[PDB]
Symmetry: D2
Subunit: 440 residues, 4 copies
Amino acid sequence: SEISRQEFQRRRQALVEQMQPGSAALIFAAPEVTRSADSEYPYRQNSDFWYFTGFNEPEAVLVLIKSDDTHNHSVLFNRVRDLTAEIWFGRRLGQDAAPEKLGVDRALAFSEINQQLYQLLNGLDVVYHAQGEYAYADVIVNSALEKLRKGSRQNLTAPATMIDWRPVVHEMRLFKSPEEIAVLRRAGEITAMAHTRAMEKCRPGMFEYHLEGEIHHEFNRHGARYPSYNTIVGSGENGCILHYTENECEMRDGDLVLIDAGCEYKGYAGDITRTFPVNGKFTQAQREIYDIVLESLETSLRLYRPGTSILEVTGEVVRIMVSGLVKLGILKGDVDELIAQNAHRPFFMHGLSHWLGLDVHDVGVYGQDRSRILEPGMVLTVEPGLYIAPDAEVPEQYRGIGIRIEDDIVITETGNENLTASVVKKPEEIEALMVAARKQ
Amino acid sequence: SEISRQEFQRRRQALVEQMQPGSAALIFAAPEVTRSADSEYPYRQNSDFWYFTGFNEPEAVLVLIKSDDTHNHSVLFNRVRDLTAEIWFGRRLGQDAAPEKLGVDRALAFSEINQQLYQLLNGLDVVYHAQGEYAYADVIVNSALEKLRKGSRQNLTAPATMIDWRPVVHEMRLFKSPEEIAVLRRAGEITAMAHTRAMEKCRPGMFEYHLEGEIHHEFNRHGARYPSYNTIVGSGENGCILHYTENECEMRDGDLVLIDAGCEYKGYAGDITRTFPVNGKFTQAQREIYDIVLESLETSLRLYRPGTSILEVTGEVVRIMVSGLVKLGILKGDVDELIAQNAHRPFFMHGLSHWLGLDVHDVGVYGQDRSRILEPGMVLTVEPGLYIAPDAEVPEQYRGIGIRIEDDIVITETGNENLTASVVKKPEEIEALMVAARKQ
Amino acid sequence: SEISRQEFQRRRQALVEQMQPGSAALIFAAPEVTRSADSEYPYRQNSDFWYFTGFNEPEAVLVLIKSDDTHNHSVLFNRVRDLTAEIWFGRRLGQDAAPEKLGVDRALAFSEINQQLYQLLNGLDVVYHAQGEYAYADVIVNSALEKLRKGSRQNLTAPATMIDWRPVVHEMRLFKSPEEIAVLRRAGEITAMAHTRAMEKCRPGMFEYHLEGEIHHEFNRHGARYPSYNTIVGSGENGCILHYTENECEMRDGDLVLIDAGCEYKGYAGDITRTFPVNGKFTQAQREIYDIVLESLETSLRLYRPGTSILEVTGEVVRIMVSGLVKLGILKGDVDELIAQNAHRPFFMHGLSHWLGLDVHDVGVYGQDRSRILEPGMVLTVEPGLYIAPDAEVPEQYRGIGIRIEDDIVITETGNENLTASVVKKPEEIEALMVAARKQ
Amino acid sequence: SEISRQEFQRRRQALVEQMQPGSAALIFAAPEVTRSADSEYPYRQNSDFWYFTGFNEPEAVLVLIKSDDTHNHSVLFNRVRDLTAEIWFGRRLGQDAAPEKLGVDRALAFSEINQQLYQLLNGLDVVYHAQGEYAYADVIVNSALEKLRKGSRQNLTAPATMIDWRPVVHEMRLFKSPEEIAVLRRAGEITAMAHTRAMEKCRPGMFEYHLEGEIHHEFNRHGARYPSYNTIVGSGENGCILHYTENECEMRDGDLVLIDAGCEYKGYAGDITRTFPVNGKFTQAQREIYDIVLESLETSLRLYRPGTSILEVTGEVVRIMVSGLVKLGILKGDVDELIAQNAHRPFFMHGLSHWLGLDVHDVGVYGQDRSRILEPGMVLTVEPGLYIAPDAEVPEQYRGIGIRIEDDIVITETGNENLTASVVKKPEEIEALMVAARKQ
Ligand SMILES: [Mg+2]
Ligand SMILES: [Mg+2]
Ligand SMILES: [Mg+2]
Ligand SMILES: [Mg+2]
Ligand SMILES: [Zn+2]
Ligand SMILES: [Zn+2]
Ligand SMILES: [Zn+2]
Ligand SMILES: [Zn+2]
Ligand SMILES: [Zn+2]
Ligand SMILES: [Zn+2]
Ligand SMILES: [Zn+2]
Ligand SMILES: [Zn+2]
Ligand SMILES: [Zn+2]
Ligand SMILES: [Zn+2]
Ligand SMILES: [Zn+2]
Ligand SMILES: [Zn+2]
Ligand SMILES: [Zn+2]
Ligand SMILES: [Zn+2]
Ligand SMILES: [Zn+2]
Ligand SMILES: [Zn+2]
């Protein structure tokens, strides 16, 4: 699946619809980023700029100009073509091919932006700009507006109103179109295949990073070159660290391993967590914690639908958690009192769900305490976990256990669709998968 | 292989030996780097800071203070320990464990650096600082020196002399110790195994990125998690682009594929290029160009030794190249005149050799035109190539061919040691390797 | 005359009337300014901040908050009281006395602004801020808005709209109240007395700066400590330099002297130019040029009224000028053609009139080519001049003559009131004044 | 008196003598400074730049290049000539006239500095630059050095050592030449005449600012256009504020007035304080405090000579002060104990003496607690004072009295020369001067 030319056009038009007449919106590309000395990290476009263009070059600026309710045009600033720079660092779109390729009306050289941008903003009333997003962008925008402010004898006037478009654009990104959902559906499948493979390859004596290598190879073979975030492979006590990315330890028979990993496919993030026994067989103590986390996930998957909220489903998870932990003797007391005291928090100290899309922790307003009423088209994670510290004052057998189980869902008219259920999470199914792999 | 505690200590002492008495050297860690929104790229330490510490955290500063020829001490600023921040983002060394772990005399909280650094610089005559390396470092250093300048009524004085330590430190990095050479030797082996595997896996109809995935998986399985630079897989005309990293094309029977890829192992870069037929059999036209590049490499490997230079060996390569191209009718005229006119430059437009180490394009002075006399301990690449443009005015059969062949070497007392010869480059050996793999 | 507490209150309310509901306006004080090393220039408050407060301290910020059409409040950030800092550098208002003294609702310590400002902006929709006016102000404002943007988990939201209040506030300043006109009337009288005195004191052999000293002493004795701009005393060829402030030459019998000087009285600028003979008697050649400039001024004073514009009156002046210069043989040809060719421009190369108020070149929109229709309450200068270069190709007797004559006026219901007519400008009256003084 | 072409040349040569071979010193002009909107304060050149040039324009840079012990040259960057900009804002030296006018070898356009400065620094070992003095200068210098650092393929190298020249140059400025002393001698005379005049003009009912006007007029008439610092006229309780510059109060019969005022003559500061009765007759209580301050001054004038220090003379003043105050009942106890407890500090809370020159509080190292041994050529103030707060718990008659008496001196071979003794300070002489004036 991919995003069409037409879809990028629709998105620009939907932004322009919300803009005041006599205004321009300025959306800037991500800068290139040094890794060390003269080597740079693989380029990652700004998600908002990508959303409106599908254009993967730096030194580019999308300018959407609204004259009135039925009249608007698009201008792209981008890198000029250059035989020498392209023989070295790779091909460029340039100005000639850009209108047709990216569906914009006009394309100018980014090297001329300081000579041209103020002319495009002259006489407008409003400019939409994400101030503080990038320092280079602020320099360009402030420089244009100062030229206009100070150029009254050349009959120039600056727009007096500046509006942050991030609220508007993030509210758009919060609701996925059918095309976006198809892409995320494939991201979830790719990510699932990677997690299945990690379970199948895991053996005692392999290092945490070996499973990372299997996962990344699987992403790559389906055309997802990069992960959406740095892969987490926390075996044993490392599973109690939420963003453990060192992945440097030998995996030991008897330990669990927690894998949080997700691909980036056409810009969109997969995001799955599976926790499983390194030796393919859960112990009793491991099952006892795992079952609480799994019931939490399974109950949440049943509950999530239009009209509820992350907050409301999180309350059900807290209840399941506090009850399970009391039954194991990890918590002591009255369930309802422990719930009122938030007694689960030493063991489950993060949110159940985040928005998912072009960023793994996606944009969009959550409402106070994530109380926003869910509607169809919202995409989110469901990721309960329990993390018992090596030195928690609890029965010995539960100490140093970290378990998270995470699926990615889209809210539908009647409930939700699970994008990541093609990798197993029921303990008996995990064990059968690993046994089958160890034969073959 | 690894770098010892003792070696990091030796390096600090070697820097201190060159410092003026009554001085302090300030070496800052790399900042963390955003990939998108709240997600960050995998952390890569500043190579110079790494060189003196082997410490892989941000928000850290090494301060080496020389009182006199026999008296000096080391101070580390680093992140304080924090239970909440470590449960989330992973473990920290802290101040208690640092002296023993990293062999420094004292360790302070990076959060206190503005309160402490000026006190360490007070009364000194010289400060060694890499001005403009990082903006956060300059803010910290300039702020310390202003406090001292303006604090004469508190009996404070700033050092009046500031010296860039990069020349000194890069000159040290230019000459590798036995330990560094052992590490680079393993980086070369790992990188070679990856390239061998790419040749063995290549089939028509696979995408360029599939070979990238094989290479990265192989790096990872030997404990080199990351590449030293973004992998290049240029098949067909893409091989004429020097840093082609899109790797997005279907590999076609009849084309060559150029792979430039290198692992990062204990901080040190491997860097190999192999070019080979996608279908496992070089055509006549492909052999004709390949043989010129291979003779260039093989002649260079014979010539490189103490007392010659990159410039001098490059002259021999130009001669081989111009002669080969004249014999094919790609160039026309007298060889010596064509050489004098640099007629090879449309086809070979980059340097033959760069320094190699903690950075793939490593630090160290080259001398004018890379004329510096080579000495034992220098590590460098040998990477001749020929790139015939799709639209070059040459016989049709050579158009759109890009071939580079690259090995990594260390200069020894009598010649050089080749770190990357365990992956084949002779055409008959390449073909046999691919045939054997295709059976299986 | 002075500006009342009530007037400052009215102005704030008039700004608040124009503000959107759910908004705050931020008006910052001028920074202190170094003259050399640790000595500073006499403090000059930002004119806009002064306009709303009459408060003459740095490190102060006026915050006007509009909840709705009938509900708003004012917050002042200002310097805390400090016995040591006040014994040294002088008295401070502080927070206790400020509400009553300056008519604001609340006053907080400027040292706490970063801890408090974001709390005042939280939940608002709009912030009025003059971006780029002062760098310290932008740092404070951007820092507040970033706290709000990134603080959604603390239930903070930033206003998405930022509006430049300078257009609104400058449009207010463009129309003077009766109180402001009374103050400017006194500024014009003070400035006139100074110019009268300079004419009375002028003798051949005195230096240009001596007349500057007389003028400044006269400003000071009426309670106008500072000039509104750097005083111009251009004798001879120095009169051809528009902002000649060197004032370093011996004044010579036979030369004219051009004095452009104005006091600052309760913040408001006087601005007068008189040109006169150093020896008290105009030559024929001097009269011939002077009469053109004087007719230009006198005709303009008759014409200026509601309904005309600076542009329209400037056209009449150009006609007078071109005609006078043709009659002297300084220009040659048809008057109407010379007018169409703007043939006056080598001799009169500046505007006839600028707005006058808290700044000598005051704020307010002029319209294209200063075409804005004049209305009652506008205050402006009328300053025709003719400047014949030392090397102009004109009859010898006119070379090196610079003459400007300038009065300050306020537009009334039926015409204008001249604020500066108490210093003579008719040549016979100038000569009589100087003769009388020489006896003284 | 003035400073000769030859003297400016000597100073540059004296700096070059101390510079390392293969180095360049960069001395930047002061930026222009806004007073309000488009009006600027009178230009004040950077004192160090002035010291080496006597050049009073902005956008200028002196570059002194030392090749070796007998070979060096000077380059000036300055504003190009421009007919339009000079007709408006006044005459410019330009490049043609500068070598001869300012005694430099070469002069280039400041508009070309970024294209030329790096070429002048290329291949040098050391650059002398006052980092953090001006932000525009740092931008220019850092930009030049980055070009050199990164331009090794164009055979460019940056100097690795940067040295602050301020210590060296301020140490030079600390010792005045005969020419400088002659200029300061005239500054002291001018300043004295101004103070004499203020005493002669003072009447009850005049405002503090009226005496400021008399003083400034007197500075101006002797060719000192500007004061060296903002004039202090503190009558009554205002005399207890050390830098009282409001000068806004009606002077009352019965009060003292403290005037601290100094001219700037050819760049050099006068700096005198005289305190006197507004009505021309000291009361008993006023005499009692005045006599302590006067004895302090007179004893200091006797003591100051080569071989003592400000610290040592300050100890004698403290003794005189504590003894006088004990005798009046302002302090109670044993003199030697009160001295040991620094019991004078509520009443005398500033230093006795500061260096004087191109800045009123001049550059130069004081040593710890101003303990530096005085040598011939040092110029300094002697300014004891006693300030009894309105609410000090002392006998009523001394409350609200501020008295300072200040003279400017130069250390000679055998003692000191008093530059400001031509204005009276003995109380009987003050009273006679005022009585004589009142007749005017
Ligand atoms: Mg256990
Ligand atoms: Mg072909
Ligand atoms: Mg003449
Ligand atoms: Mg009294
Ligand atoms: Zn249109
Ligand atoms: Zn965004
Ligand atoms: Zn996850
Ligand atoms: Zn997640
Ligand atoms: Zn020691
Ligand atoms: Zn470096
Ligand atoms: Zn390579
Ligand atoms: Zn290489
Ligand atoms: Zn209210
Ligand atoms: Zn303004
Ligand atoms: Zn004027
Ligand atoms: Zn004017
Ligand atoms: Zn020379
Ligand atoms: Zn200085
Ligand atoms: Zn003084
Ligand atoms: Zn003083």
